[PDB]
Amino acid sequence: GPPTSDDIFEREYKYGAHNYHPLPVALERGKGIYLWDVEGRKYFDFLSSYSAVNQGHCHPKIVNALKSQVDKLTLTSRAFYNNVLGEYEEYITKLFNYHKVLPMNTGVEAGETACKLARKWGYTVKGIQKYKAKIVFAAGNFWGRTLSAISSSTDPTSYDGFGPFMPGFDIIPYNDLPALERALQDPNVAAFMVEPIQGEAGVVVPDPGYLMGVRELCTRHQVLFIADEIQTGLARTGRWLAVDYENVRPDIVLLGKALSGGLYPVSAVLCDDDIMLTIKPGEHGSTYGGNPLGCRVAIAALEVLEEENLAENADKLGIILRNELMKLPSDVVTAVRGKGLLNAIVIKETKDWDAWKVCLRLRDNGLLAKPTHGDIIRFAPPLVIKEDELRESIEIINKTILSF
Template sequence: MTGKASASSLDRQQILTALGRHWNPTAALMMAATERQVESHAHGSEVFGEDGSCSLDFAGSYGVFLVGHQNDAVREAVLHELERAPAIPPGATHPAMAELFSLLLEILPPGLDRFTLGCSGAEVSEAALRAAYLARPGRHRIVIVAGGYHGKTLGALTVLGQEEHRRDFLPGGSDLVVVPPGDAASVRRAVSSRDVAAVFVEPVLGGAYLRVPPADFLPEVSRACAETDTLLVADEIQTGFGRTGRMFAVEHFGVVPDIILLSKALTGGFVPVAVAAMTHEVASAARRSPQWHPGVLEGTTPSALSMAAATATIREVRRLGLPERAERVGAALRDGLRAAVRKHPRHLVDAPGIGMMTGLRTRNPAVENLISMQMSARGIHLGHSLNEQMDQPVLRFYPPLTVRSEQIQRVLQALDESLQWLDRRPAWLMRRITWLLRRQYQLPPPLVLKLMHSNLKVNW
C-alpha cells in the first residue's frame, strides 16, 4: 500500500471471515457487531476508514501513539535506517543502540544507567523479575498491586495484578503478595519480613481501573523498600514519555525506582521496542549471583529500526514539549470529562486521570459499551476497558499528545450528545445489557449480530 490507497482488496465480510477463521473469532465477532470500519490509513490524531470516513483516535492503542500516527520525524528515521542496516545480527552492536542509550541517560531519573532491551513490555517485565531474583538472592516473594498489569507472557503473569487472568496458569501464587491500590501500609507490612525481592507498581494504575494514587503512596513505598533492601520496580509502559504531564510519572512523586520499565510510546507507533533501565547497584548485584551469565538479563535484541524509532520518538517528545503539553492541553479534556460526570451522575461515577491519561468511570459495563458505541458512530475511537466483569469500568481517553484543542472540543461535544442519547434509555435496559455483556461469549454468534442489528454473517 502506498499513500492513501485502500488497505485491502477484500470486502469487510471477507476480512472478518479471515480474522475469525484464522486468528480470533471473538474479536472478529465484536468487530462485526459494532460495525467498526476497516482502517485504511492514519495520521496525527486521525484514522481513516476504507469508506473514506475520518475518526479521531482517543484510544491511542493505550499509549502507543503518543507522538501521533505516522509522525513525520519518526517515519523518516525508520526509513533512513531501513536503507542502511535494518537488522542487528546476534552479538553485534549498532550506532543507533548507543544513540538510544545516550538519550535515555539524558531523560531518565539519575542512576538508572544499565539497560536491558526487548521487543515488548512483557519481555522487560520478565527481565526485571530475573534481575530482582538475582540481585536479592534468597528472596522469592514479589509484591504487586491489585489490578496492575505487566504483561501476559507466562513469566509476566507472575506479577499480573489481575487474578482472573493469572489463576489458570499459576494456581499456587504462594510467593505473590497482592496489595490494594494506593495502600502503602500494606506494602510496608509485606516487605517488613525482608523476604520480598521486589515491589512492582504502576505509578498511575492503568487498565480498566485508572487510579491516581495518593500523593504519599509512592514516597512511602520507596522508603519502605529502601529500609528493607527491597527493589522498587516502576512500570512506566503506559505512563512514560509525557503521558501524565511529566516525562515519567514517578517525577510527580519525587521517587527514583531501582528499575523502570518502558515501551508503548517508545516505539513511536512504528516498531516494537522495550527497555528495562536499572541502577548500577542492581546490575552489579545480579552479576554476583552464582546463576549469573551474560545473557540472563537480555531479551530479544531489537532491530536497528526499533532503535531509530525510539531515538526519533524521544527527540519528538522533547522538541514538542509533550509532557508540558499533556498537562496544559490535557486540563481541558479532564475538565470536560468532570463536567460530564456532574451533568450525568446517573451514568458516570468520576473522571480519574492526570495529564492526558484520563477517562470516565462508568456506573456499569452497559454504560461503558453504549458510550463507546455512540462515540464511534460520531467518529471518535475510545479505549474500551475490555473488562465486562467489573462493576464500574473506566472508558479511557488516551489521545496522542499532539492532539489539537479543537479536536478535544469535538470529542467533548460528541460525548455530550452520546450521554443525552443515553439519558433517554430506561434504567432496566442498562441492567439487561450488563447481563448480556457478561455472558456475551456464551451467546450464539448469530444472535449477537442480530441483537446489534448487523448485516454481516458469521461464517467462521
C-alpha cells in the same frame, strides 16, 4: 473491490485466534490524532493504542528514521555489535538519569527482565537464600501475558486455567502504604513492582503521597522499587515519567509502547550499575532486543516528545478534558479520573445501557474508545492533539452521552 469492514471482521474470525473481541471498526489509515476505516470514515483516536502512539500516528520524523535506517542495517543479532545501539543507550540513559539500559522488545519482556534482575540482585547482593526471593505486586496490576505476568494478576480472566503459577509473587492492595509496610517486614522480599497509575485496571490514580511513601518504604527495607511506566511514561500523564509528579526516583524504570511512537516493538529496562550488573554476559537477552532499526526509531520517538513539549501539552489539555467531563450528568457518568491525557470515565451500568454501547455510539459519532473491566471508558488521545481538536472531541463525547 476492496474488503468492507464486515469482510475484515469475517476473515479474522476464520483464520485468526479468538483471543480478542475488538470494537467493530476496521482501520486502514492513521495520521496524527485521526484514524480512517476502510469505508473512508474519519475518527478521533481516543485510545492511542493505549498510549503507544503518544506522538500521533505515523509521525513524519519517526517515519523518516525508520526509512533511513532500513536501507542500511536492521538486525545483526547481539552476536555482533551494531553501530546504533550504543548511541541510543547513551541517549536514553542520560535522558532519564540512570547509568545503564537493557534493551528488549515488548512491555512484558521488560517486566520479565525486571523480575530476573530483582531476583538475581536479591540472591547475590541482598543475601536472600536461593530460591526464597519474593516480588510484591499491587492488586489490579497488568504487565503482560506471559505465564509469569499472569501469575501476579488478580484478574481471573488473565490467569484462570493457565496454571500452575510462578511462585514467589505476593499481592497487596494498590494505593495502600500500611499494606506495603506490612508486606515488607518479610526479609526475603527483593522488589515491589507497581504502576504509578494503573492503566488496564481503569486509570486507577493513587492518592497524593503514595509514590513518595513507596520510595521511602522500599529504601528503609532495601527492597527494589520497580516502576512500570510502560503505559504512563513518555509524557502521557503530563511529565516525562508519572513518578515525576512526586519527585520520586525508582530503582528500576520500565518503558515501552510509545518508546517507538508505534512504529516498532521497543522496550527498555533502566537502572544503575549496582542492579544492572548482577546479570553477567550470557545470562539474558533477546533476538531482536537492541537491534539498530528499533534503536533509530526510539531515538527519533524520544526526540519528538521532548522537542514538541508534549508533556506540558498533555498537562494543560488534560485539565480541560477532565473539567469538561465532570459537567456530564451524575446519573450517567459516575466518576472522572486521570492525570494529563490518561483519563477515564465510569458509566453507571444498567440492565441495558453500558460502556460497550457508549463506545459503539461514540464510534458512530466519530470518536474511537473502548471499555475496560466492563464500565470504564478510557480517554487517551495522542499528545499532539490541539485545544480546538480536543474541544471538538469533547462535544462528540457530550452528544453521545447525552443521547441515551
